[PDB]
Design an enzyme around this catalytic site. Structure first.
Site, PDB file in Angstrom:
ATOM      1  N   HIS B  41       0.867  -1.155   0.010  1.00  0.00           N
ATOM      2  CA  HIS B  41       0.273   0.242   0.062  1.00  0.00           C
ATOM      3  C   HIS B  41       0.777   1.026   0.015  1.00  0.00           C
ATOM      4  CE1 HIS B  41      -0.021  -0.211   4.491  1.00  0.00           C
ATOM      5  NE2 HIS B  41       0.466   0.934   4.272  1.00  0.00           N
ATOM      6  N   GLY B 143       2.974   5.713  10.097  1.00  0.00           N
ATOM      7  CA  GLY B 143       4.282   5.442   9.638  1.00  0.00           C
ATOM      8  C   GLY B 143       4.896   3.988  10.187  1.00  0.00           C
ATOM      9  N   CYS B 145       3.686   0.969   9.476  1.00  0.00           N
ATOM     10  CA  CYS B 145       3.690  -0.182   8.514  1.00  0.00           C
ATOM     11  C   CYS B 145       4.870  -0.431   8.046  1.00  0.00           C
ATOM     12  CB  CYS B 145       2.754   0.324   7.599  1.00  0.00           C
ATOM     13  SG  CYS B 145       0.951   0.348   7.911  1.00  0.00           S
TER      14      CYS B 145
HETATM   15  C1  LIG Z   1       0.937   1.842   8.184  1.00  0.00           C
HETATM   16  N1  LIG Z   1       1.831   2.835   8.424  1.00  0.00           N
HETATM   17  C2  LIG Z   1      -0.333   2.441   9.014  1.00  0.00           C
HETATM   18  C3  LIG Z   1      -0.715   1.739  10.593  1.00  0.00           C
HETATM   19  C4  LIG Z   1      -1.879   2.352  11.281  1.00  0.00           C
HETATM   20  C5  LIG Z   1      -1.954   3.902  11.211  1.00  0.00           C
HETATM   21  C6  LIG Z   1      -2.830   4.007  12.442  1.00  0.00           C
HETATM   22  N2  LIG Z   1      -2.301   2.791  13.359  1.00  0.00           N
HETATM   23  C7  LIG Z   1      -1.777   1.832  12.516  1.00  0.00           C
HETATM   24  O1  LIG Z   1      -1.420   0.704  13.068  1.00  0.00           O
HETATM   25  N3  LIG Z   1      -1.484   1.680   8.117  1.00  0.00           N
HETATM   26  C8  LIG Z   1      -2.671   2.413   7.519  1.00  0.00           C
HETATM   27  O2  LIG Z   1      -2.975   3.517   7.921  1.00  0.00           O
HETATM   28  C9  LIG Z   1      -3.527   1.630   6.675  1.00  0.00           C
HETATM   29  C10 LIG Z   1      -2.976   1.870   5.264  1.00  0.00           C
HETATM   30  C11 LIG Z   1      -4.184   1.633   4.015  1.00  0.00           C
HETATM   31  C12 LIG Z   1      -3.894   0.897   2.914  1.00  0.00           C
HETATM   32  C13 LIG Z   1      -4.909   0.687   2.128  1.00  0.00           C
HETATM   33  C14 LIG Z   1      -6.189   1.229   2.389  1.00  0.00           C
HETATM   34  C15 LIG Z   1      -6.499   2.018   3.532  1.00  0.00           C
HETATM   35  C16 LIG Z   1      -5.262   2.350   4.393  1.00  0.00           C
HETATM   36  C17 LIG Z   1      -5.214   2.980   5.667  1.00  0.00           C
HETATM   37  N4  LIG Z   1      -5.130   2.090   6.788  1.00  0.00           N
HETATM   38  C18 LIG Z   1      -5.639   1.948   7.962  1.00  0.00           C
HETATM   39  O3  LIG Z   1      -4.909   1.228   8.678  1.00  0.00           O
HETATM   40  C19 LIG Z   1      -6.929   2.377   8.182  1.00  0.00           C
HETATM   41  N5  LIG Z   1      -7.677   1.097   8.659  1.00  0.00           N
HETATM   42  C20 LIG Z   1      -8.513   0.576   7.985  1.00  0.00           C
HETATM   43  O4  LIG Z   1      -8.924   1.080   6.939  1.00  0.00           O
HETATM   44  C21 LIG Z   1      -9.300  -0.807   8.358  1.00  0.00           C
HETATM   45  F1  LIG Z   1     -10.087  -0.469   9.605  1.00  0.00           F
HETATM   46  F2  LIG Z   1      -8.520  -1.703   8.590  1.00  0.00           F
HETATM   47  F3  LIG Z   1     -10.319  -1.104   7.366  1.00  0.00           F
HETATM   48  C22 LIG Z   1      -7.119   3.586   9.236  1.00  0.00           C
HETATM   49  C23 LIG Z   1      -6.469   3.106  10.666  1.00  0.00           C
HETATM   50  C24 LIG Z   1      -8.602   4.112   9.369  1.00  0.00           C
HETATM   51  C25 LIG Z   1      -6.232   4.632   8.577  1.00  0.00           C
END
Ligand SMILES: *C(=N)[C@H](C[C@@H]1CCNC1=O)NC(=O)[C@@H]1Cc2ccccc2CN1C(=O)[C@@H](NC(=O)C(F)(F)F)C(C)(C)C
Ligand SMILES: *C(=N)[C@H](C[C@@H]1CCNC1=O)NC(=O)[C@@H]1Cc2ccccc2CN1C(=O)[C@@H](NC(=O)C(F)(F)F)C(C)(C)C
Lengths: 306, 306
Positions: B41, B143, B145
């Site tokens: 992603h 950040g 991930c």
């Molecule tokens: C990585 N950097 C980050 C880790 C997150 C941020 C807050 N706490 C964490 O553990 N990952 C994300 O922000 C992901 C990435 C992503 C890829 C494709 C589509 C959307 C996203 C947004 N991300 C989410 O984790 C979101 N969660 C969801 O969409 C779901 F709940 F899993 F469906 C969100 C935490 C709302 C940003």
């Protein structure tokens, strides 16, 4: 989101661990530049643990009575000296993995990471606090002495603990890296025992702020308290007094959450008097006191280290 | 003595962490030999998070759209490919600190250490379990991930988790290092949410054995139970069924303590029905389920790693 008992990355310390042998005793040492630091009780023998005279024991030793092993490599000891309860072995090789480092003697209530080691090899890493009674609730077995505790700040490892002893209650005693014990303890087999401990109030409050930051407010209330009236309750529950300096230190967490320190104190008072009635905070059914205010800000802000 | 939530020493993993940037998105990567592994992603943009077509997004990218930074050094990307939900960036330099390593996909109930990282720099290390619902109760911020989970066995790092997502309950979802999610989760912004979780019974029993090893027997009783009757109670308390294989796995801890597995099950049954009535076990007022039988033997025997 989330909140875990989080240790510092241990790599910079792993590169410093060695094995020290004197006679039939083997334990761990800390290799920084061309010096290896280890507990002086490595020179003791079984029949003289009650009251060793370390100056008399050490003068009878030669450099070649000390075997230092880093990985598979032997390091030759070329000098030795005793500083308080630590032995400093000068070696023929400077550790090429020496990090930027300091030695610090910490205050009770401060936390640090422990790299538990056996035979100079790291086993695991966990977080501990210096308790008010100057013991630590570690996890240590035979051969663990010389394992160290540390904090990291930017690129700098601040070593604050070297492990020496286990007390009859199963808690642990040791020294700063200049060999001074924390607490009233000694490197001898005698009647010594942990004094009565207390709960670290400022840390409990920090962890309650961590709970609010992470989305949980169930334990808050509409009340406030004076510092004096809070401390009257704290004393009743074997909590340490909260000082104005503690209040000042909690300032940032109070500002980030919008909850005045004395308002959080009123919340803690109610928890002490009422209990949790079956609920948890950050996955605990107890009031946790081994997170400092700085620990909370670190983990809730994602500070890094190099 | 003592028993702590203990992580593996993180040094071998620290040496593998890098920063990966695509467009305006920065996260962490894992640099092994001449390949950098990271969440796919990283190639997403803000307006296409609901249902990205990653194959269509990636074919539009060039090697030079990927910026990989190890410390202060830029690594040039010379090839790329997608495997499931991970991107593999071929780089012009092999990581000289590559440890001996494997990729493993773990079973629910297994534990591992997480090295939380931001901008390619390690922040902290903590222990977690793969929950039965295939979430992990991590501590992760924006950040994070690309941070990985791992176990160490002798000299070999077994990577088992890469972090991708946070779910609405504040728990975490990610992949094995071949990019397959644990659980029914996806790298897209959709209605997904943790399924109902359960307590990992075999781990609770292991931790009760750890308590006995460390000198605490208060919770034992004179009773035994059949496996069937135990599981009838377990189900009532949202505990996972205990299988004969679990019983077999607990064999060593049973043998070391002299407490038959089904006798410990009778003890657990009583704790579930009665509670702890104000007492603690290994410093917890809850029944802890994120220690495996192997974790207990490791920490109560002082196994080391190189
Ligand atoms: C990585 N950097 C980050 C880790 C997150 C941020 C807050 N706490 C964490 O553990 N990952 C994300 O922000 C992901 C990435 C992503 C890829 C494709 C589509 C959307 C996203 C947004 N991300 C989410 O984790 C979101 N969660 C969801 O969409 C779901 F709940 F899993 F469906 C969100 C935490 C709302 C940003
Ligand atoms: C270091 N390798 C080891 C760590 C211990 C062993 C079990 N758990 C631990 O944390 N330290 C010792 O065994 C020390 C060394 C020592 C130096 C001088 C005199 C006597 C000893 C024996 N040690 C003890 O820790 C003993 N404890 C005490 O004597 C006292 F309770 F602190 F007073 C004992 C655990 C009984 C071996």
């Amino acid at each position: 989101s989330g909140f875990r008992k989080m240790a510092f990355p241990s790599g910079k310390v792993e590169g410093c661990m060695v094995q020290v042998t004197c006679g039939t005793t083997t334990l761990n040492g800390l290799w920084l530049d061309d010096v290896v630091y280890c507990p002086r009780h490595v020179i003791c023998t079984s029949e003289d643990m009650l009251n060793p005279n370390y100056e008399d024991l050490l003068i009878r030793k030669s450099n070649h009575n000390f075997l230092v092993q880093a990985g598979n490599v032997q390091l030759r000891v070329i000098g030795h000296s005793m500083q308080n309860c630590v032995l400093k072995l000068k070696v023929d090789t400077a550790n090429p993995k020496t990090p930027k480092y300091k030695f610090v003697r910490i205050q009770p209530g401060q936390t640090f990471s422990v790299l538990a080691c056996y035979n100079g090899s790291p086993s695991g890493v966990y977080q501990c606090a210096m308790r008010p009674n100057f013991t630590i609730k570690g996890s240590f077995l035979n051969g663990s002495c010389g394992s160290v505790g540390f904090n990291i700040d930017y690129d700098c490892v601040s070593f604050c603990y070297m492990h020496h002893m286990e007390l009859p209650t199963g808690v642990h005693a040791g020294t700063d890296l200049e060999g001074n014990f924390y607490g009233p303890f000694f490197d001898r087999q005698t009647a010594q025992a942990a004094g009565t401990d207390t709960t670290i109030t400022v840390n409990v409050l920090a962890w309650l702020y961590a709970a609010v930051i992470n989305g949980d407010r169930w334990f808050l209330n509409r009340f406030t308290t004076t510092l004096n009236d809070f401390n009257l309750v704290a004393m009743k529950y074997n909590y340490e007094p909260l000082t104005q300096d503690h209040v000042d230190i909690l300032g940032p967490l109070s500002a980030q959450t919008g909850i005045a320190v004395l308002d959080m104190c009123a919340s803690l008072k109610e928890l002490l008097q009422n209990g949790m009635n079956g609920r948890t905070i950050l996955g605990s059914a107890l009031l946790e006191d081994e997170f400092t205010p700085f620990d909370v800000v670190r983990q809730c802000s994602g500070v890094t280290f190099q």
